[PDB]
């Protein structure tokens, strides 16, 4: 097994359970109209 493969496997297993313990020590609108790219269809 390559080192990259070993690291990827280690990280994959770590990433399965990301602890919620993360301790440190303009407004959206929508236009009214959709633009059609290919009206000839």
């Amino acid at each position: 097994e390559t080192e990259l493969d070993n690291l990827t496997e280690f990280n994959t297993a770590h990433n399965k359970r990301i602890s919620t313990l993360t301790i440190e020590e303009s407004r959206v609108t929508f236009s009214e109209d959709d633009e059609i790219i290919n009206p000839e269809d």
Partner: protein, 293 residues
């Protein structure tokens, strides 16, 4: 590695009757993979982006539809782009699609962004066409090089602290944004947990809270989940992809979440439109639609 040459050859087939291949050399593609991979790792796994920005959902190897979207929205770097993942599988030209996207990431690394979708994962794209395309047109070693590059893609993005973007959706494990930042790369997609969910979860109108997902992985989540999430993090909108929708885009929970799907006539099995969402500097969002044949 001559990047402008590569992009020139990829764009050359624009206007050709859809389906004409571009055959870059194996070394050129390997170069794209290795250089974009370096760039992905040098940038945050949770991107923080500013408008104006154009956002696209699943492309799934529909190269000529990608070119139509770029043609209307403006080819990089005319406009800034964020893609939400699922570049490969199902379509006939995954290779041209991912090569052009990676080329633009390398050429304009501060103005062009790609998130990871659930198909940017060897165990999925082994089965749904990308492995086959690589084996046919190149070799399986190039496929493994793509996998190593996919394993470094960022996972989510926040636009102007108001629009949370990811491929699938929310996770019952997602309590703080900092948790996404703890995810380590390179990585495969685990079969459960925060990373899995961000790539695999779906909204569902009939579920209060969290439900089972018919996909057989991750969860579904209801309108109330979306609302409490937006409120807690002072966000206005979730923007995700991952599911084909008739009109190309589709709202959920009274416009608090939008699904974007950019590949029209998906798989030649659905009659959906594709859509891209443009976000201007005031965060006014509009939709540009590719209607089905």
């Amino acid at each position: 590695l001559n990047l402008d040459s590569i992009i020139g050859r990829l764009l050359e087939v624009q206007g050709s009757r859809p389906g004409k291949n571009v055959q870059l050399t194996e070394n050129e593609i390997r170069g794209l993979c290795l250089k974009s991979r370096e760039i992905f790792l040098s940038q945050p796994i949770l991107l923080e982006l500013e408008a104006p920005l154009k956002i696209c959902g699943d492309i799934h190897g529909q190269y000529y539809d990608l070119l139509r979207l770029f043609e209307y929205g403006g080819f990089p770097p005319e406009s800034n782009y964020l893609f939400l993942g699922d570049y490969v599988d199902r379509g006939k030209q995954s290779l041209e699609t991912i090569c052009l996207l990676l080329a633009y990431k390398i050429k304009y690394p501060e103005n062009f962004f790609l998130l990871r979708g659930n198909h940017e994962c060897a165990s999925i794209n082994r089965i749904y066409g990308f492995y086959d395309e690589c084996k046919r047109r190149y070799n399986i070693k190039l496929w493994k090089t793509f996998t190593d590059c996919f394993n470094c893609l960022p996972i989510a993005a926040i636009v102007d602290e108001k629009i949370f973007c990811c491929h699938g959706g929310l996770s019952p494990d997602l309590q703080s944004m900092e948790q996404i930042r703890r995810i380590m790369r390179p990585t495969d997609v685990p079969d459960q947990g925060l990373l899995c969910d961000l790539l695999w979860s779906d909204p569902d109108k009939d579920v209060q809270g969290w439900g089972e997902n018919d996909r057989g992985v991750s969860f579904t989540f209801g309108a109330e989940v979306v609302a409490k999430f937006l409120h807690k993090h002072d966000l206005d909108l979730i923007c995700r992809a991952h599911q084909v929708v008739e009109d190309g885009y589709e709202f959920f929970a009274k416009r608090q979440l939008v699904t974007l799907f950019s590949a029209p006539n998906y798989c030649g099995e659905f009659d959906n439109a594709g859509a891209m969402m443009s976000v201007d500097e005031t965060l006014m969002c509009s939709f540009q639609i590719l209607k089905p044949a």
